[PDB]
Design a protein around this ligand. Structure first.
Ligand SMILES: */C(=C\C(=O)OCC(=O)NC)CNC(=O)c1cc2c([nH]c1=O)CCCC2
Ligand SMILES: [Cl-]
Ligand SMILES: [Cl-]
Ligand SMILES: [Zn+2]
Ligand SMILES: [Zn+2]
Ligand SMILES: [Zn+2]
Ligand SMILES: [Zn+2]
Ligand SMILES: [Zn+2]
Ligand SMILES: [Zn+2]
Ligand SMILES: [Zn+2]
Ligand SMILES: [Zn+2]
Lengths: 120, 365, 119
């Protein structure tokens, strides 16, 4: 069954950098897109970024374009999120998510979540 | 009537109608045939098992066929079989991942490998621009997405009915220490509190609202009080001007301003039990104030003043210039020998505008 | 900024009735399609229904069409899901979702969810 484990969260100073990783298991990694979503205080889930099965296409929410880089290493079943120029509004739980092609479900599973806080 | 492969007599809605050749295939013969093609054959062998109508030795229709076949392959195949179909399509046809599009209108996802900039969703059959994903119309032809997006937002009646309230809301308030942008109007209250970092600052000039005995400004006479320091063109001061004098500064510099619409519909964020409720301003909208209340109409005039960096000191009388000299230069002005009132006025004005700049952090435009 | 608050979930017997609500703020509600999705215990996310910006068109998953009715009130910035004749397979966390015009996803925001149990 699908298993996802995020890693890398922590306390970040404003404008600092952070790199999240996500180890995946329980499905053929290279067969699906992967996505990052995040939960800000008091909210639900905000889509952050999506990467295509072999990294051809990378997509980003407007508020993170030019600051975040999504990437994947299919030989290790691992997803990465490189986060630069972090601001207070980037404070959130960051979730790894297994993509899907089904209608209305860009992802069908998401992981435990790693917490990132940006000091003020 | 019956399946074209095995003959099994099922109703039409119990089989799979291949959208290309119009053949009715039972769900089992459909699945087994296409997977064994993935298993031990090649992807050019993914033609209807009964007919053979898709010509796979032909780069004319190859991509539009796999785009439509992908849909029925997803619904009928297993997860591992559907993965080989994307792997082989990537490694044998496209040399890359396929372009997957999400219809914004009905949430359906599909492969779109055509050259056109508009795409028809196979589910809801509506067409949308591939880049901006908005609904496609003839106006978008030959126009950039921004041009199109600005054109629709500009002529949507609900947006236009809001009047100047949208311009006030759109000019954001950015906390100078945490960088969160709130996108609210200011009204008459300058003292802003930021929810994320608790910073207290003036929304007109972004200067700090210092707590008791925290202000470091020299010669400050209210150090034991909560207070901020504002430049002379900050709304904190210009809100005390009449609308007439604010308009005179705009007229002296050929800056246009509305006085009729192009209570007060400006949206404010009132705090309710657990949450913020967007309650409209709703105060009196006098004639000549462009449909806004007085405080919001003055805020609109000042942001025009600030956007153009107009100096209110150009209209100061002598006593105003003297106040400004003590406030910002920390010296009590005094006339010199031979000066008449205009000469005294001209001297105080020149020294003030040379030594004290306009708001250095005031949001302009 | 964007917020979606679901309410209306709880315990209900089979064949019962339940109406979920999703209060929306932080964006122009009338200009986006909205949706309901759900995650049954231990299962993957499942799409339930999508409604057009002004409500002209509705779409439904097969297992819920005719039993569930999606609707919206742009005057109130609220999205509704009227669930009738509940079954045991309907127990799940239900999420409302905002339609997205960004490339790479059909939705860009989900609520924090509301739990539904059918005993
Ligand atoms: C002063 C607000 C005030 O005095 O309320 C009553 C009024 O406007 N006139 C009678 C200025 N402060 C704000 O407008 C303000 C708004 C927000 C926040 N912080 C503020 O200081 C944080 C949450 C977003 C709204
Ligand atoms: Cl897309
Ligand atoms: Cl919006
Ligand atoms: Zn058959
Ligand atoms: Zn055929
Ligand atoms: Zn569609
Ligand atoms: Zn466009
Ligand atoms: Zn702040
Ligand atoms: Zn100020
Ligand atoms: Zn002071
Ligand atoms: Zn007002």
């Amino acid at each position: 069954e699908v298993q996802l484990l995020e890693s890398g969260g922590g306390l970040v100073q404003p404008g600092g950098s952070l790199r999240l990783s996500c180890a995946a298991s329980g499905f053929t990694f290279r067969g699906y897109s992967m996505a990052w979503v995040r939960q800000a205080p008091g909210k639900g889930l905000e889509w952050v970024s999506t990467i295509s099965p072999i990294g051809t296409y990378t997509y980003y929410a407007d508020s993170v374009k030019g600051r975040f880089t999504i990437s994947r290493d299919n030989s290790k079943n691992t997803l990465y999120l490189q986060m630069n120029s972090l601001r207070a509004e980037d404070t959130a739980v960051y979730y790894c998510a297994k993509g899907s092609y089904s209608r209305g479900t860009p992802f069908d599973y998401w992981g435990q979540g790693t917490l990132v806080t940006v000091s003020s | 009537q019956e399946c074209a492969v095995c003959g099994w007599a099922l109703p039409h809605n119990r089989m799979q109608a291949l959208t290309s050749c119009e053949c009715t295939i039972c769900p089992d013969c459909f699945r087994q045939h296409f997977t064994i093609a993935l298993k031990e054959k090649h992807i050019t062998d993914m033609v209807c098992p009964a007919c053979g109508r898709p010509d796979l030795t032909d780069d004319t229709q190859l991509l539009s066929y796999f785009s439509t076949l992908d849909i029925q392959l997803r619904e009928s195949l297993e997860p591992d079989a559907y993965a080989l179909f994307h792997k082989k399509l990537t490694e044998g046809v496209l040399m890359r991942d396929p372009k997957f599009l999400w219809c914004a209108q009905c949430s359906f996802g599909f492969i779109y490998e055509r050259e056109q900039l508009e795409a028809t969703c196979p589910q809801c059959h509506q067409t949308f621009c591939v880049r901006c994903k908005r609904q496609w119309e003839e106006q978008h032809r030959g126009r950039s997405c921004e041009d199109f997006q600005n054109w629709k937002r500009m002529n949507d009646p609900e947006y236009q009915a809001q009047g100047l309230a949208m311009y006030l809301q759109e000019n954001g308030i950015d906390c100078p220490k945490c960088k969160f942008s709130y996108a609210l109007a200011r009204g008459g209250c300058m003292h802003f509190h930021c929810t994320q970092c608790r910073h207290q600052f003036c929304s007109g000039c972004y200067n700090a609202f210092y707590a008791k005995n925290k202000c470091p400004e020299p010669n400050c006479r209210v150090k034991k009080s909560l207070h901020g320091h504002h430049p002379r063109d900050c709304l904190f001061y210009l809100r005390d001007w009449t609308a007439l004098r604010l308009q005179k500064l705009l007229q002296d510099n050929n800056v246009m301003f509305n006085t009729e619409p192009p209570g007060c519909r400006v949206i404010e964020q009132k705090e309710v039990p657990n949450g913020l409720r967007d309650e409209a301003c709703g105060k009196e909208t006098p004639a000549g104030y462009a449909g806004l209340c007085q405080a919001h109409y003055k805020e609109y005039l000042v942001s025009l003043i600030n956007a153009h960096s107009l100096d209110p000191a150009t209209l100061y009388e002598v006593e105003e210039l003297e106040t400004a000299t003590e406030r910002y230069l920390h010296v009590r002005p005094q006339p010199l020998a031979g000066e008449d009132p205009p000469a005294y006025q001209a001297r105080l004005l020149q020294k003030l505008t040379e030594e004290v700049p306009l708001g250095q952090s005031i949001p302009r435009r």
